[PDB]
Amino acid sequence: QWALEDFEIGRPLGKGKFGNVYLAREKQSKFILALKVLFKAQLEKAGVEHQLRREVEIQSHLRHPNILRLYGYFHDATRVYLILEYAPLGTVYRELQKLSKFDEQRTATYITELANALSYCHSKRVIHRDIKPENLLLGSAGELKIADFGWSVHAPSSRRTTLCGTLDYLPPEMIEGRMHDEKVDLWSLGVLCYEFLVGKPPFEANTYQETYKRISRVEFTFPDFVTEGARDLISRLLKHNPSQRPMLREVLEHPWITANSSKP
Ligand SMILES: Nc1ncnc2c1ncn2[C@@H]1O[C@H](COP(=O)(O)OP(=O)(O)OP(=O)(O)O)[C@@H](O)[C@H]1O
Ligand SMILES: [Mg+2]
C-alpha cells in the first residue's frame, strides 16, 4: 500500500539498535508521522525477523490513547519501514535527563497512563516486557505513550531470545530465563516509579553481573525524600514472587496515586 516515494523525509527523531527513526510527511495528505527504519541484513544476522513480525502484528491491532499507533509497514530490498504515529514531545528518557527527577504529581500521572495502557495490553494477553524510559514517548498534550513492541509477546512465555541491553527494568524471572506472564510489566512499573522519583533505577550498577545480583536479591534502598506512600507502592510492585505483585486495578486505586495523579 505504501512506498518510500510517498513520503517527504525530515530530521532524525532518535536512534535504535537496527536503524533510525525519522520525521516524515505523507506527500498526498500532508500527514506528519514517523518512519522507523530497520536494516534487513542486521535483523537476519541477529535472528530477530520474528519479534519484528510480532511487533507489527501485536502493535497494529492495539488502539488506546496511551499506546503509540502503528499505521502500517513496507520495505525495499535493504530496509524495512514501520509507519508510526509521531510523538512531538520526545521521550520520558530525555525529560528525565532535563529535570533530573520528577515530582509526585508528574510521576503519579505517568504511572496512571502506563497502568491504563498496560491494563489494555494484558486484557488481550499481550505482555510488553521492554517498558524503559527510552520507549515512553510524549504526545502534544504531554501525555505518555507506550512504544517499541519489539519484545512484546502473548503470555505465558519463556525466552530463548537473548537480552543484549541493561537488565535494569527486567524482573528476576526474565533475567533467569524462566517462564513468565503479565506480572513482568508490574515489576517494570515499580522500577519506573522509583526512577521517576529518584532519578536512577533501584538496581543501577557499574556492571551487568552486579545488577543481576541486586535484581535477584531485590536489593534496593530509598533516599530520605521518598515519601511513605511512594515507598509503599514501589515496595508492593518490586516483589521477587510474581504472584505477590498487585493487579493493575490496585495500582490505579493506590492512595498515593489517587492523591497525586492529575485528573483529565
Ligand atoms: N514515533 C516516534 N516519535 C518520536 N520519536 C520516536 C518515535 N519512535 C521512536 N522514536 C525515537 O527513536 C528511538 C528508537 O525507537 P524505538 O524504540 O522504536 O527503536 P528500537 O529500540 O531500535 O526497537 P526494537 O526494540 O523493536 O529492536 C526512541 O527511543 C525515540 O528516541
Ligand atoms: Mg527502544
Residue numbers in the entry: 127 to 390
Can you quote the paper on this entry?
Aurora A kinase (AURKA) is a member of a family of Ser/Thr kinases whose orthologues control progression through mitotic cell division. The localisation of AURKA to microtubules in the mitotic spindle is mediated through its interaction with a protein partner, TPX227. Besides localisation, the AURKA-TPX2 interaction modulates the catalytic activity of AURKA3738. Here, we report the identification of AurkinA, a drug-like inhibitor of AURKA, which binds to a pocket occupied by Y8 and Y10 of TPX2 in the AURKA-TPX2 complex (the Y-pocket).
To provide structural insight into how AurkinA binding might hinder formation of the AURKA-TPX2 complex, we determined the crystal structures of the AURKA catalytic domain in isolation or when liganded to AurkinA. Interestingly, depending on the concentration of reducing agent in buffer, the AURKA kinase domain crystallised either in space group P6122 or in P41212. Analysis of the AURKA structure in hexagonal crystals showed that it remained relatively unchanged when the ATP binding pocket was occupied either with ATP or with JNJ-7706621.
